[PDB]
Ligand binder design. Structure first.
Ligand SMILES: [Cl-]
Ligand SMILES: [Co+2]
Ligand SMILES: [Co+2]
Ligand code: NA
Length: 282
């Protein structure tokens, strides 16, 4: 099975005009990066709504992952679920991104662009969807097998899922943020995988990437302590091969240099008064 190349982009999908757009839509940058890391009770409840909807869109699009389907079709399906539930797709017009979700096959680390690419037997596809509703964002992603996936690739996918859920389960107030990436990287290294460093999780709230960074590798120099009401993503990308990558000409698509496959899962988490709540739970 060949290295991927860019397919054909379908036209911008419409969203009904009553759905409120994030302020960044139709601008080259977003106003984000300095928002509070701890959210209000109002915003947390609104984030449960957004997370639930993002979780729905993801599962719907996931269900359509099958050999013969296009990445564009996955986007159509996610786009339609969001719109039907009153949500704007946060990726659409975010720093000029042209679609409603990210579709990342095989050697694509992240930020793949839904297009005419046809999914083949044995492929793995990450779908990353974000919902904007009630002035807040909800962000979740999962890698889905298509047809008869090779053992090597099923194990990667399952272990990436596990690393994510383990990291989630360390989330509690008063614990160091750096714990997340120590857990993830020690789990990945146990099976000889390498954790992507240059792409991270992020705080999320009224803004999509609010300035908080969540590293998926061991980096104990981070002093940040988790606090009740904090909201952020854990979204590790785990590589079978080396870390080196290229970015396609489209300015988004990140591909491993050795072309070995890579996988990712993501949830949006709340730090509660005593632990964690998964806001993007199905
Ligand atoms: Cl579109
Ligand atoms: Co995401
Ligand atoms: Co994210
Ligand atoms: Na991938």
């Amino acid at each position: 099975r060949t290295a991927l190349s860019p397919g054909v982009l379908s036209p911008t999908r419409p969203v009904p005009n009553w759905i409120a757009r994030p302020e960044y839509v139709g601008k080259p940058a977003a106003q984000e990066g300095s928002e509070p890391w701890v959210q209000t009770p109002e915003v947390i409840e609104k984030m449960r709504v957004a997370g639930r909807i993002a979780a729905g869109a993801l599962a719907e699009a996931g269900k359509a992952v099958a050999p013969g389907v296009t990445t564009d079709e996955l986007d159509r399906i996610a786009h339609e679920y969001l719109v039907d539930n009153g949500a704007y797709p946060s990726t659409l017009g975010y720093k000029g991104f042209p679609k409603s979700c990210n579709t990342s096959l095989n050697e694509v680390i992240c930020h793949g662009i839904p297009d005419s690419t046809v999914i083949t037997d044995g492929d793995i596809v990450n779908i990353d969807v974000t919902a904007y509703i009630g002035g807040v964002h909800g962000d979740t992603n999962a890698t889905f097998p298509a047809g008869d996936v090779a053992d090597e690739h099923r194990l990667l996918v399952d272990r990436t899922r596990e690393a994510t859920m383990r990291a989630i389960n360390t989330v509690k107030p008063g614990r160091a943020l750096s714990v997340i990436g120590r857990v993830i990287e020690s789990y990945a290294n146990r099976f000889g995988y390498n954790v992507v460093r240059d792409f991270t999780g992020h705080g999320i709230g009224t803004t999509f990437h609010n300035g908080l960074v969540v590293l998926h590798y061991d980096q104990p120099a981070v002093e940040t302590i988790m606090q009740p009401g904090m909201t952020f993503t854990i979204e590790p990308m785990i590589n079978l091969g080396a870390l080196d990558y290229e970015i396609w000409d489209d300015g988004w698509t990140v591909v491993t240099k050795d072309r070995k496959w890579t996988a990712q899962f993501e949830h949006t988490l709340l730090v509660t008064d005593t632990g964690v709540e998964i806001l993007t739970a199905l």
